[PDB]
Amino acid sequence: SLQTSFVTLDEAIKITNRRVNAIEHVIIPRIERTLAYIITELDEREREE
Amino acid sequence: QVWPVRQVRPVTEKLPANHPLLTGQRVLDALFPCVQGGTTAIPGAFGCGKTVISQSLSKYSNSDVIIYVGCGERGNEMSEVLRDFPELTMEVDGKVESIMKRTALVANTSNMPVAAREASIYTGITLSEYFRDMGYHVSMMADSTSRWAEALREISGRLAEMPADSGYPAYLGARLASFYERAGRVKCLGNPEREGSVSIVGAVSP
Amino acid sequence: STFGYVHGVSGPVVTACDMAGAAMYELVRVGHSELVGEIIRLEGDMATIQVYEETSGVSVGDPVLRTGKPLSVELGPGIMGAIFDGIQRPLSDISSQTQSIYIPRGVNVSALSRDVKWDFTPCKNLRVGSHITGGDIYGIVNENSLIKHKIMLPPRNRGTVTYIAPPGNYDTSDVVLELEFEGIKEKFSMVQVWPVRQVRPVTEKLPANHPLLTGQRVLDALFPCVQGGTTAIPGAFGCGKTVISQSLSKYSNSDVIIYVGCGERGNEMSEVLRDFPELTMEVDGKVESIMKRTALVANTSNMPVAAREASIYTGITLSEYFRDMGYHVSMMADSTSRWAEALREISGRLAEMPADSGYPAYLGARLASFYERAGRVKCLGNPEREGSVSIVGAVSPPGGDFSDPVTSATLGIVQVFWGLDKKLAQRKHFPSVNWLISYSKYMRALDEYYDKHFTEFVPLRTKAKEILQEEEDLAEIVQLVGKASLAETDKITLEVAKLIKDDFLQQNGYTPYDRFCPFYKTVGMLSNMIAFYDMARRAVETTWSIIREHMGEILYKLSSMKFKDPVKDGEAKIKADYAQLLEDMQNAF
Amino acid sequence: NYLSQPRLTYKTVSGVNGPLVILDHVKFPRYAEIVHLTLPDGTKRSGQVLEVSGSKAVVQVFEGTSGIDAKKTSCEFTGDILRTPVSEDMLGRVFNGSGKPIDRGPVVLAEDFLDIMGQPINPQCRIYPEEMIQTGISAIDGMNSIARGQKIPIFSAAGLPHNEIAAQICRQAGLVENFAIVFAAMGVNMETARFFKSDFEENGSMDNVCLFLNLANDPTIERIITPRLALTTAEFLAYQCEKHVLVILTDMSSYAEALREVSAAREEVPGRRGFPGYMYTDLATIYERAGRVEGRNGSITQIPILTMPNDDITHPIPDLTGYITEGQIYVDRQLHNRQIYPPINVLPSLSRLMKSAIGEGMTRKDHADVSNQLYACYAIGKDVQAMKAVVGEEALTSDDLLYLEFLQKFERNFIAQGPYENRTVYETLDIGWQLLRIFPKEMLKRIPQSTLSEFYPR
């Protein structure tokens, strides 16, 4: 009962530690440099005005 | 004959384009094909190869004549054109002759004056409409139509005109429209009843 | 002419007429209460002036009294212990002459009082008839017990001495020296007036070689600063900023201090103005107050925005006048982020074009033309002296982000950055200087001093830097897999890194033994802690357990090293005790 | 040929604001004309007429309008545009930004007077650069090799050692009989000026080095004419004295930041991030003054150093530089924290003239193919390194472990070389071929089977 719950646990840890590292490294660094592009492009609409 | 560069050349009737422009590149001929008599834009940043696509299209395409307009680009790029073109030939009727015999250059580099970037575009299309009327299939490569648009911005900054978005004048889209519309496969004026074509491949530098 | 008329005021800006011989950026006095303003445009006979004060009740036709000078400081005796604003009005005299709590908007009170008497004595080389160039010391005023105020010539003029003063007590209005030149003879008192935007002339820039002994152990060893250098610190709410600003005034080898609070706050400036008069300096005799060698430039944000933008140039010009005497000045601009907000309002009022995030086009050039006024240089004048100016400019970025048109333009001009951290204050690690984000670029010029004076310090700290740089990649795996898979070589260098962050770097400022750790204590407290490391490097190449349980008392002798009080403990005893610990480690191994 | 009429001296200033002085009653003013202000307190300042209109002349001064009167200042109109006294004796001397000597020396004895704006070379008589300069750096001479007549910047940042590799490519500058180096420093510190000055005297090279140093405390309108002075003497040495010139324009971001303040004072039309609309043409008037011509045996090569803000290649300083020049050299911050001395990230680096400067007669046959495979094996292994940080260190294909074996052996052995080591191009290609030995013969797709049979078994 502790062997079948052991090998199914690290099967569900690798699918979670990848989904955490898919957010910290692919999704959030794509949003935080999208938001860095909005502010530099909204500063240029103010100088043109 | 003397002809104004801002006046469109008269012609009998416009025709739809049917024959393609085979550039020689594999992705360009297969996926995104262009016809002779068609308009094409090549945007891209520095280091992408906007010139190498234009050099490979001026050497190996199926166009009769080639007119290459360097509008505000590097001086060594217009100096490598007239180096490797007379040592490159083509075979049309069993004989070989260099591809510089079908090429005319209009070179106005970025070191040269600014307002002559506009005069180099309108010259290169008027030589392109002249060889259109003989029945040839002209192909025109404006090397940068984004340095022409920076020439219009700097002239409009001295006239104190009101800008459009990003400082360009409000008539920017009307000068680009009256330049690309002069292309097309079209039945020429005159009694011997021939047909010509102008293909404009203008590389934008955003 | 001498008078102009107002002809129209439209806010802070006055378009004064009848001013033909007026210069650009020249200070005038607008109105009946004589509000101070500067000429900013000049269209024929009219001069467009923006007023520093609040224009209210200024009529058309009020006199505009021309002065003929730009914004300039008065340099002379009576400056040590004085508190000015950014345009050098004496705050300690305005509150005494007027007996109130406000600044009365029309005070042309002189920055140096002309009622106190100063004991003047000449240089004893100058006689009547000597040729004198600009920058020559022709007298010394014994201003305090600490500071001898060397009266110098202005760098502009030149001539031949025809009248020197006898030794005695004078005001700042009495004529002291008189100089014949070609056309007319010039006479001038002990005070000189120098424009704050104009860089002080000097003979030759010298390279900076001598370090600033700040007193802290992490700053004197790992990220050293030189006298004549430019540093920068983050200006957050609380990390360590109060003790880095006060240990550098108490425990440094700098002769005079200038502290420029530049539009700070209401209560954050009243905290500074009541803590610096109550500081104590341990000179070789008895204890003294710190205000015998310290001047303050105090600005809150209620003050004018051009008296907040020119507070930096007032502070660096007081720092350069005391540089030319031969002293080693150290200047701390309390905030340069609040100074660049005074440029954005000055440029935003003139309708200048914004460059980046609202800041004007000349932001990076005005910051460079101030940090390049700092340096150890050989001064003007035939007495053949040398001086220095060190600049510590704090930067408070928005949100603690190091990407900003002020912060990213500061890190490209300064050489040293002492990175104070908010997290190390929450863990009570004092001082809170981080070691990863900090750096120092004066190490290549400091080896020539270290090989002539200490000679076992340069490879000492590079071993201490690679230990802590190793700890950050070891810190991610101690929670990943754990110490059960940690190597016998890697688990010891983690355990001496915890000895580094506890004994060397962490230094309590209220304990009487660690208020001023000199460099003889600093070289000793690391030479017995790196020699412990490499003898523990061959001990694992021959057991990690028996060196931790048997040398636990030797672990205590290194962890009570920082206690070897050097005020009341001799230097030679501390060197003697530190050699005895070195023999105990070499014998136990 | 020569001006003989006396000079008119006006006291007719009628307006001054910012850096612009406006004179009235000027008799036939000339565009781009130099004037000589003398202040009421006696100091002299120079100027340049920027716009005429009828009888007015809008002159900007090079030192700032601080103190310029409306009645007492006197402005003398030199009747010609800005020419500088150029000579062969401007080689071994240092100068400031305006024109003047710094090293306690005399003025130039003026072999002739050249206009600093120049005039553009005819593109028919401009020949292609062919002879590869072996500069002794493996990241350059391996994959980003420069030619003799090539403009190529060093894309840097703040704090990275771009001054150090500037002095390193000065010593080892030779062909695969020395370079007359012209150095222009604009907006630099005091230590950066002393680092370049004491290095050109250390290697004995200050007999053919003309330093044009303009410090950070020098006026910001003298930074405009500083590259124009250092390129009008470089055209005198290369196109008249037949000399091979190496021009280094360090801190080109301090030139264009000094270009933004002048245009914002004139209220010109802004481009991106406040820079003027003519920033492309103003940068190209000092970048396209390079190459070699057909009638001469001299040449001029430009290596303009610039620091990009916030490590961004899309800022208007390094973006508009890539459109004019012929490929860039990109030093990196991530390779500087690992204490690699040349931190040259080769992926956004380029040499547009390297294809004509390498080959069989130039260096050797295998050069064009090993550089395409060293570039592709580096680009795949950085994509693999961006994959193992998300997936794991153990869920990779066994082919993907060789790309981690490549990069750790690439950055420490190929590009890292030390500050005084000058590897030849035959040293580099035998080091670059060692890193391809760890891959199979049919995983190198860019190299054909012909030149694999001659070089890969070794």
Ligand SMILES: Nc1ncnc2c1ncn2[C@@H]1O[C@H](COP(=O)(O)OP(=O)(O)O)[C@@H](O)[C@H]1O
């Ligand atoms: N087919 C190719 N094979 C190898 N290299 C190429 C090829 N096409 C382009 N390049 C490289 O791309 C570079 C782009 O040249 P260029 O077009 O002038 O840049 P830009 O787009 O700024 O004009 C060339 O110098 C060359 O080194």
Ligand SMILES: [Mg+2]
């Ligand atoms: Mg191109």
